[model samples]
Target chain A: ELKFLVVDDFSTGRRIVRNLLKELGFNNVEEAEDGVDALNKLQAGGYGFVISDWNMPNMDGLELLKTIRADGAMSALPVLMVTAEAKKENIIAAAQAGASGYVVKPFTAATLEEKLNKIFEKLGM
Target chain B: ELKFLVVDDFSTGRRIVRNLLKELGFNNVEEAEDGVDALNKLQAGGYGFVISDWNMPNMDGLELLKTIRADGAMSALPVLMVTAEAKKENIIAAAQAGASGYVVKPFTAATLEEKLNKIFEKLGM
Candidate 1:
């Protein structure tokens, strides 16, 4: 019963993630067009999870991830990072900077479900 | 020292899975062109894990998966199914048929790693 926020510059990107989350039985999801919008919604509070993309027009994923980590109220939130290419260095960098889970772009329902549940397990929730 | 079998119709698919397995420090991996080839190799014995693609020429992954689960010696062996689309019904069918785990196509190093380790944890290996 966790509230989720999906952040991506593309409307379809956020919709894709939102639909997938709903498939996994997580219907209480909200969307943000970019990191800036995401932070705004997050600051408004009540979001327990975040699924975000690394590239965006306004406040890219890396900066958003960093911002969330630095913020006190949402520092410990479970954030799953999404990227188009499996770029090893970038993926490693995301992990190092504190992503709860890494999602390779163009994923399936099973992949998303597995990624989400694993993070849920990690946080013992 | 577990041996893993990577079965896919595409060469790059097998190589991708094999490479990721290697990254997770499991270098003892064997590749098969399709389900038939995988069965041939598996029947020869000593494989601890199987990563297979659903669409193949002679014997599709579902057939190979069901065959393995029915065969006494290989019945308990962990089989990870890989699919391109989510296909909810097909996924549930595979799960009911006794697949150890599922992998969505075009996955990342981290995704493959997470999928593998979760199965490993489940089997207590």
Candidate 2:
């Protein structure tokens, strides 16, 4: 019954993650091609989590995170940055920007599972 | 098993954290009323992470963090410090003292999730 919103400009990447989530038994998955659309959908609520790519055309992932944190209704939503950038400074920037999680690209489904479970465990989910 | 130790001198606070965890779908949570008690439980091999309060009898959350980092076995274990101490310096100290994440007190279950997910995303776990 868990619902998720996956945002990425790359259609291939979006489909891949959506398929992976379905394989994991998560059926209520929605997709957005950029941060603006993601934010619009997010403000409506009912989403359990957000997985977003950092490099998007309109409003990047960091902007999306800040916007979410600034909004009272969705202030504490978990915003996970799933991107190709692995630089430490980038990671720190995302954290300071209020990202709830970050994952580098070229990751496998197993790694994805581990990352999700790790976050859930840390948050006592 | 993903094990977690909850540290808070007030049984009520500790119970609140535990119940929130349960509601969030996590059940493998252990509780301790003070820093010493929590540290002892955490030093054991099974615990994977820690959720601690700022104040406690005998040692404290910050001291416990130092101890964990000082140990080879538990070093790098993800630590999320939850405290009523919302001072900027206190949060910076926790960050400098090896805390993987930080959460202010009276936080919602979603806030806990936000902090945890952010750490995982940064570390690409």
Candidate 3:
């Protein structure tokens, strides 16, 4: 029953992530167009988790992450970075920035599920 | 006399790539243990191109890319991503993030050479 937010600039990316989440039997999800829109919705409340893209207009995933980390109320919320930015450095930055998990783009449903489960296990969720 | 860098956390990986490059007659190469090491040498000058792993300790490939892209001195330096991350999303992300080429792990020496030559042809290197 975890409420999740899927944020990406591309409609296709949102849909794909959503579909993957659905396949994992978690359908309680919503979409945001970019970091700006995502932050607005997040501030409005109720999302327990976030899956976001790295590169987007009007605030990329990393910026959104810093914002989330800085917000006292949302700092503890889990964020799973799903991005096309698949460099070793990018993954480290996300971890340092407080991402709950990192899944490189074009990832499989299995990889997503594994990362999500790992996050859940670690957080005792 | 184009200088190249091979960055990876695993010694095996670095050796494999180095050997491949040697087979290609491009022996003027150097190795870095991770992104930080790679960047240090990169900034010291003489690296014309980068071949890096996506996952490594102390700065991964993606962060190295952002740093490279951000630096005016080395912004145009060609980067070729060689990783085990084999997702369509990963490929797209690398392209968007300014990678000159992408090759998945388990790639053949031919594939490496082909990607190298393609980058050279594209950049007129």
Candidate 4:
């Protein structure tokens, strides 16, 4: 089973993502209020992937991504950024930062599933 | 002009993305055979975004992201992971790594436009 850490500042968004994951047959899902909190939890290990929002107070999703990739212990973990900010530069930055994948806000279930599946295929997992 | 660095092992894929960018009214598109070469060109600056394939020899897309984020000068450069690999964990890792977004392989012009538009909307560009 794959473990997922869903990070978002808004509870509503978190719940929505969780529910969506469940709908997609993911039962082992965890939530974090923000990037900092998410990172701490990640330290415990065993998480295969992270799904995070781009905007947040203190540690935003992008900052969190930088932190995780920089950390030697968790460098290889897959991450899919979920965000409303979908500019080319932002996308470029995220990809440059080491994100395995990304999904824009207002995305459909099909889009989400497609992106997630793509990530899995790349890792050969 | 929004400059794009289209990185892929396959030349066909590179041309296709470039043409799409052109169709979208973006003319300043450059290409790289792999991540290492792309990163080197990126060091020259002026690249607003990067669309990259996940699988490549030596420095893959993930490694490229890590290097970009790790480098003080290039940290925060936006990147969008464009690949054939589709998996939940891969998506999660990419997000955690700092990818602003991810686009799966075989994406259409509409999908690309939507992702790009979302990115632009977020950046308020």
Please give the TM-score that candidate 3 achieves against the real structure: 0.49
Positional deviation of B33 in candidate 1, in angstroms?
Answer: 64
Chain B TM-scores, listed for every candidate in order, come to: 0.94, 0.91, 0.93, 0.91
Instruction: Give one digit per residue, the lDDT tens place, for model 4 in A21-107.
Output: 888887778889888899889877656568999888879988999988766445545779886746656787787786777888877
Candidate 1 on A1-125: residue-level lDDT in tens? 56788998888888889999888788779898788999999886657678899988789988888887777455546678898877657787777777777888999989998887776454322
What is the lDDT for B43 in model 4? 67
Over A1-125, each residue of candidate 2 has an lDDT whose tens digit, in order, gives 55688999899999988887788777889999888999889766666668888888998888888886666445535667886856767787777875767888877777778777765554333
Chain A TM-scores for all candidates read: 0.95, 0.92, 0.95, 0.94
Of the true interface contacts, what fraction does each candidate have?
Answer: 0.00, 0.00, 0.00, 0.00
Q: Tens digits of per-residue lDDT for model 3 on B29-98?
A: 8999998899888766656678998888989898888777655345546688887753667777767777
Error in Å for residue B69 of model 2:
31
The best candidate in terms of lDDT: 1
Where does model 4 sit among the CAPRI classes? incorrect
Cα interface RMSD of each candidate: 17.6, 13.2, 20.1, 13.2
Off by over 4 Å in 4: B1-125
Please, what are the lDDT tens digits per residue for candidate 2 over residues B1-125?
35668888888888888887777776878888777787677544456567888877898899888776655335546778887653778887877787888787788889777776786555422
What DockQ, on C-alphas, does every prediction get? 0.01, 0.04, 0.01, 0.03
Task: State the lDDT of candidate 4 residue by residue for B1-125, as single tens digits.
Answer: 56788999889989989888898888988899898999988766656677888888878998888777655334445577886654768888777777767899888788888988765433210
Docking outcome class, model 1:
incorrect
For candidate 3 chain A, the 10 contiguous residues with the lowest summed lDDT are A116-125
Q: How accurate locally, in lDDT, is each candidate?
A: 0.79, 0.74, 0.78, 0.76
